[PDB]
Design a protein around this ligand. Structure first.
Ligand SMILES: [Mg+2]
Ligand SMILES: [Mg+2]
Ligand SMILES: [Mg+2]
Ligand SMILES: [Mg+2]
Ligand SMILES: [Mg+2]
Ligand SMILES: [Mg+2]
Ligand SMILES: [Mg+2]
Ligand SMILES: [Mg+2]
Ligand SMILES: [Mg+2]
Ligand SMILES: [Mg+2]
Ligand SMILES: [Mg+2]
Ligand SMILES: [Mg+2]
Ligand SMILES: [Mg+2]
Ligand SMILES: [Mg+2]
Ligand SMILES: [Mg+2]
Ligand SMILES: [Mg+2]
Ligand SMILES: [Mg+2]
Ligand SMILES: [Mg+2]
Ligand SMILES: [Mg+2]
Ligand SMILES: [Mg+2]
Ligand SMILES: [Mg+2]
Ligand SMILES: [Mg+2]
Ligand SMILES: [Mg+2]
Ligand SMILES: [Mg+2]
Ligand SMILES: [Mg+2]
Ligand SMILES: [Mg+2]
Ligand SMILES: [Zn+2]
Ligand SMILES: [Zn+2]
Ligand SMILES: [Zn+2]
Lengths: 93, 25, 88, 81, 97, 116, 129, 150, 91
RNA sequence: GGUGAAAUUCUUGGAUUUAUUGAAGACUAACUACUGCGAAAGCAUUUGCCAAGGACGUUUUCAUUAAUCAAGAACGAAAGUUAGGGGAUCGAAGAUGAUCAGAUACCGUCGUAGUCUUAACCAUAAACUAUGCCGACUAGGGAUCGGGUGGUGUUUUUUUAAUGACCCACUCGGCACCUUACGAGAAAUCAAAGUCUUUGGGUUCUGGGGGGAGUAUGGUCGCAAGGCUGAAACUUAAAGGAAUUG
């Protein structure tokens, strides 16, 4: 039987959603059902600035959206498979 | 065997049976 | 500077316009200990006279990078691996 | 709520409800005699014109069509009777 | 459009279709406008425009062949030229045309 | 010119709608150039809607006027006075003076230029 | 479309009964509706109703009590020969003690027991118990 | 509802309880029936007449100053159009989608809605035919119709 | 009554040379025989002969064209892009 | 270079890299959401044109003109087929390098068709909500999309409005979610899957143990691949569903 009433993710009343392809393995996955994680980490960080011009002017970072297909979301990234009633909680943390 | 491979196995079968008696067409 | 996975690149030139060489076991080409080891002789020639692979797939810094001009598309040029991806 | 007068409900409860879902249906739309004080005898308009009306003698414009807020251009009086 | 504004002179005003009637209309001064299909040849065109200048009639070059100009005027035949003879209530003589 | 990876990717927050518009335009100066432009939506700062979206009579009417005022200073100059014109950048809200009558529209910049 | 207009009133009452609630407005109050609410009050399963007059097809409010388990409309409006009224009562009435199966006869809408009194018959309308 | 969709959105008009005149309206019957026929000969649908008389003038609804409905006055003054106003529009639509189809010949969508429009026409006509307001021979066709609007 | 389900004009070849060869011949046959619309006078009076030669019945004009149609796809896409580069050399 | 690691591979031809720069075809990133639209398939840069549509508003018009539907017809992802063009990408086939006892594979490499487009076909998907359509009734809850009504609400300050966006309340019609359970169910769960043994609102369609088998046969559609229609002999006591414990 069903073991999610959403039974994909996040698509009610649309019929078809363009697919994205997974960062890890390139497998195709419907955009609505790709677990999305935005990775923003920045560019050892004071050695950077002492021996350098512009005395800490800007400090910019990576900005990048990530899409994994369940299979590879499950392998490493944030899936951490939940229990039967623990999984309906869509609180991010 | 998988369902859709039994489909393939049968589609093949009938294309072969279809052939065999157009011999006696 | 440009960082693959299983390589990192570094090269001086005029504003107008180093990899898996100091290490050779060829799994180590990415490794930071060799990014450094070949960054060393790079700043050397820097003073001796005076980017992720991206494009399509993984859009992300490599290991030997730290030890942006990343090419990103307008969502075209379908990626290798088919629709079932690399399978293990 | 398991005892509730259907026949005599509050004149405010039915003020909230829909044009058609009152007890006896009725249009919540009125008419207005609009005075543009540059002419003597002026006209009786309907609340959602959708015809930007013009009056007898002048080329006036009074109204504008809308979603129903039949906007009474430059300022004038009226009466909902 | 202007097909709109032209389509009003058929049901309202006086007109005449065709090359030959159109030029006795340009000789007797009766035409204040004539509309000329796209494809009608240039020799004929510059002739009409001569007759127009002599009647001091204005012209309008209709983007669209005489096939189109005819189904514009509501007729089911090609019309190489029209000549309005009364602009019954169309502003065509008073629009930018 | 260009923007830089840091700033552009710093600007595209989810929970709002991006807007881009370009036009290819002359100068005195016999030059014809494709500008770019970029704007987003501000939550009016009394507002509870988490997602701060316009409804696309707006996005159509906005580039409608962005390009009206974008080709209303370039060919309103040489390239020289052009470089002189975008460096104080106050064209950036020479869009906004138009758009304050339509939408909140934070983070309006011009964000590239690209030529022949 | 609403087809057996009677039903859409009748069922609301049944819903309106183990609602607990003891009024219900019904739509749209045909002549056959009133002469059905009437026969029920004649035997005490509802109290008083009021024909609201919209200049439309009508509205009733029936104030109801809790004596009634099942009123119901039975139809395609089957035809019942005088000899087989008792086959319906049997099928759809709890006991031979109480409950009526209302119906339509030439002598007017009337419960099944009055029909055995009047010796007339017709088509079956519904039932109340 | 929405016979050719699955959109169940109700919006009627609320016709008021008062079937008599609005009791603030000065002109009566004759005064303004005479008004509607000036626009019938102007060329307006009984709805354009009903609306223009609703707002620019005091006429809240035909039925109750008159007491024949609007089309029922034009019919007596001989101004009833060739065919009922609604179907006229349905055809004017069907022709207006067709000329767009026959020039954008690769539009699967409009072809679908021509079908819908046309089969709505055929059921309305089928009604008008059986109530004698259209001859029993009456039907509609792509090429007969393009000159039936104008 | 409808005379042939499939072959139309290509029945003259009868049974010979194969369905496929006949089918394809039918295609261009139908093109090279039909009357086309004249661009200069508006009448459907341009017919072929001597393939690549197209002539109006009245108004007597002759246009070079495709071997079975007046305009080939190629020709038209040249027309379009020749306008294109021409509109590029006065403004 | 490529992977877990390697190898087939590319480099006196200055490869990988940089720089300026042009070509071709494909795609619309980020913004993108429990958000929108369409009958469904499906639809995401710009602008102009072309017709079209729901909801709302409506003291406008018609006045039963409707609901659902064998036959019949329109559309119908992907692949696939015919005729051109296109052929950058990725890539059934095929060939390879590796792994394996073997390895036609999974992983790597080359790459045909294909991928795109026009003209014509084909008519199938777990084409899915595994859940017919119209009407009605039965229950709490805050979001949100479109329309609308209500204001000595806040903001733009220009000099205050007009406006625009925002706030609040209600009401229609949407996409959903939440809490309950009166109620339902074999259960999982369901505001319907409820208002059924207290069994009848209207109507369409399919199913009747498991295999045999969507096979045989005929008919019919297709260029084909195949689509629709669609048995039986025989065989068998289970097969199946949901939930529980291991
Ligand atoms: Mg399972
Ligand atoms: Mg999905
Ligand atoms: Mg689907
Ligand atoms: Mg043989
Ligand atoms: Mg490849
Ligand atoms: Mg695995
Ligand atoms: Mg007897
Ligand atoms: Mg229907
Ligand atoms: Mg309804
Ligand atoms: Mg409406
Ligand atoms: Mg985009
Ligand atoms: Mg038959
Ligand atoms: Mg290729
Ligand atoms: Mg192989
Ligand atoms: Mg091998
Ligand atoms: Mg093989
Ligand atoms: Mg293995
Ligand atoms: Mg199927
Ligand atoms: Mg599904
Ligand atoms: Mg549901
Ligand atoms: Mg099943
Ligand atoms: Mg609710
Ligand atoms: Mg709601
Ligand atoms: Mg329970
Ligand atoms: Mg229970
Ligand atoms: Mg055959
Ligand atoms: Zn993956
Ligand atoms: Zn006026
Ligand atoms: Zn000619």
């Amino acid at each position: 039987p069903k073991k999610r009433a959403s039974n994909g993710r996040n698509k009610k009343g649309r019929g078809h959603v363009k697919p994205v392809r997974c960062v890890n393995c390139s497998k195709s996955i419907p955009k609505d059902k790709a677990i999305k994680r935005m990775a923003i980490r920045n560019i050892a960080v004071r050695d950077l600035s002492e021996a350098s011009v512009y005395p800490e002017y800007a400090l910019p970072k990576t900005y990048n959206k990530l899409h994994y297909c369940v299979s590879c979301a499950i392998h490493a990234r944030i899936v951490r498979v939940r229990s039967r009633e623990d999984r309906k909680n869509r609180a991010p943390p | 065997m998988r369902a859709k491979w039994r489909k393939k196995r049968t589609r093949r079968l009938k294309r072969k049976r279809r052939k065999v008696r157009a011999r006696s067409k | 500077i440009y960082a693959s996975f299983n390589d990192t690149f570094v090269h001086v030139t005029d504003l107008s316009g180093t990899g898996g060489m100091k290490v050779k076991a060829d799994r180590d080409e990415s490794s930071p200990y060799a990014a450094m080891l070949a960054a060393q002789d790079v700043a050397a020639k820097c003073k001796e006279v005076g980017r992720a692979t991206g494009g399509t797939r993984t859009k992300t810094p490599g290991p030997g990078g730290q030890a942006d001009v990343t090419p990103v598309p307008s969502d075209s040029t379908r990626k290798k691996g088919g629709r079932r991806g690399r399978r293990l | 709520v398991l005892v509730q007068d259907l026949l005599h409900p509050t004149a405010a409860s039915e003020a909230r409800k829909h044009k058609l879902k009152t007890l006896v249906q009725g249009p919540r739309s009125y008419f207005l005699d609009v005075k543009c004080p540059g002419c003597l005898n002026i006209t009786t308009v309907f609340s959602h014109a959708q015809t930007a009306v013009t009056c007898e003698s002048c080329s006036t414009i009074l109204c504008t069509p809308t979603g129903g807020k039949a906007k009474l251009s430059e300022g004038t009086s009226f009466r909902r009777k | 459009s202007i097909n709109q504004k032209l389509a009003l002179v058929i049901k309202s005003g006086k007109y005449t279709l065709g090359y030959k009637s159109t030029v006795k209309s340009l000789r007797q001064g009766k035409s204040k406008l004539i509309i000329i299909a796209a494809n009608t040849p240039v020799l004929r065109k510059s002739e009409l425009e001569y007759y127009a200048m002599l009647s001091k009639t204005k012209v309008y070059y209709f983007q669209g062949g005489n096939n189109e100009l005819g189904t514009a005027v509501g007729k089911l035949f090609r019309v190489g030229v029209v000549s309005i003879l009364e602009a019954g209530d169309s502003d065509i003589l008073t629009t930018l045309a | 010119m260009d923007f830089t990876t840091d700033k552009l990717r710093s600007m595209v927050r989810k929970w709002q709608t991006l807007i881009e518009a370009n036009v290819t335009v002359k100068t005195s100066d016999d030059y014809v150039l494709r500008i770019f432009a970029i704007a987003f939506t501000r939550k009016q700062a009394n507002q509870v809607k988490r997602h701060s979206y316009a409804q696309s009579s707006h996005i159509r009417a906005i580039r409608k006027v962005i390009s009206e005022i974008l080709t209303k200073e370039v060919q309103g100059s040489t390239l020289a006075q052009l470089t002189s014109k975008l460096i104080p950048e106050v064209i950036n809200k020479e869009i906004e003076n138009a758009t304050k009558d339509i939408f909140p529209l934070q983070n309006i910049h011009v964000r590239k230029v690209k030529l022949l | 479309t609403r087809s057996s207009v009677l039903a859409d009133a009748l069922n609301a009452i049944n819903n309106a009964e183990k609602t607990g609630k003891r009024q219900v407005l019904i739509r749209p109050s045909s002549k056959v509706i009133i002469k059905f609410l009437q026969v029920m009050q004649k035997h005490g399963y509802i109290g008083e109703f009021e024909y609201i007059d919209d200049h439309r097809s009508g509205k009733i409010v029936v104030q109801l009590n809790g004596r009634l388990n099942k009123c119901g409309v039975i139809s395609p409006r089957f035809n019942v020969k005088i000899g087989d009224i008792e086959k319906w009562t049997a099928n759809l009435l709890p006991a031979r003690q109480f409950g009526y199966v209302i119906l339509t006869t030439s002598a007017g809408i009337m419960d099944h027991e009055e029909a055995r009194r009047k010796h007339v018959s017709g088509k079956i309308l519904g039932f109340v118990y | 509802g929405r016979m050719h969709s699955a959109g169940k959105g109700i919006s009627s008009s609320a016709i008021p309880y008062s079937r008599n005149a609005p009791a603030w309206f000065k002109l009566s019957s004759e005064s303004v029936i005479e008004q509607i026929v000036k626009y019938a000969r102007k060329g307006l649908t009984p709805s354009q007449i009903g609306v223009l008389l609703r707002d620019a003038h005091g006429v809240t609804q035909a039925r109750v100053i008159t007491g024949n409905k609007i089309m029922r006055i034009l019919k007596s003054n001989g101004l009833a159009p060739e065919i009922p106003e609604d179907l006229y529009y349905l055809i004017k639509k069907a022709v207006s989608v067709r000329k767009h189809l026959e020039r954008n010949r690769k539009d699967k969508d409009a072809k679908f809605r021509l079908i819908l429009i046309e089969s709505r026409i055929h059921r309305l006509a089928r009604y008008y035919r059986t109530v004698a307001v259209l001859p029993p021979n009456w039907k509609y066709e792509s090429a007969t119709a393009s000159a039936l609007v104008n | 009554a409808k005379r042939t389900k499939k072959v139309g004009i290509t029945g003259k070849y009868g049974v010979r040379y194969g369905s496929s060869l006949r089918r394809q011949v039918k295609k261009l046959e139908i093109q090279q025989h039909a009357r086309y619309d004249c661009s200069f006078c508006g009448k459907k009076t341009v017919k072929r002969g001597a393939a690549g030669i197209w002539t109006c019945s009245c108004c007597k004009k002759t246009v070079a064209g495709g071997a079975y149609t007046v305009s080939t796809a190629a020709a038209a896409t040249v027309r379009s892009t020749i306008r294109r580069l021409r509109e590029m050399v006065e403004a």
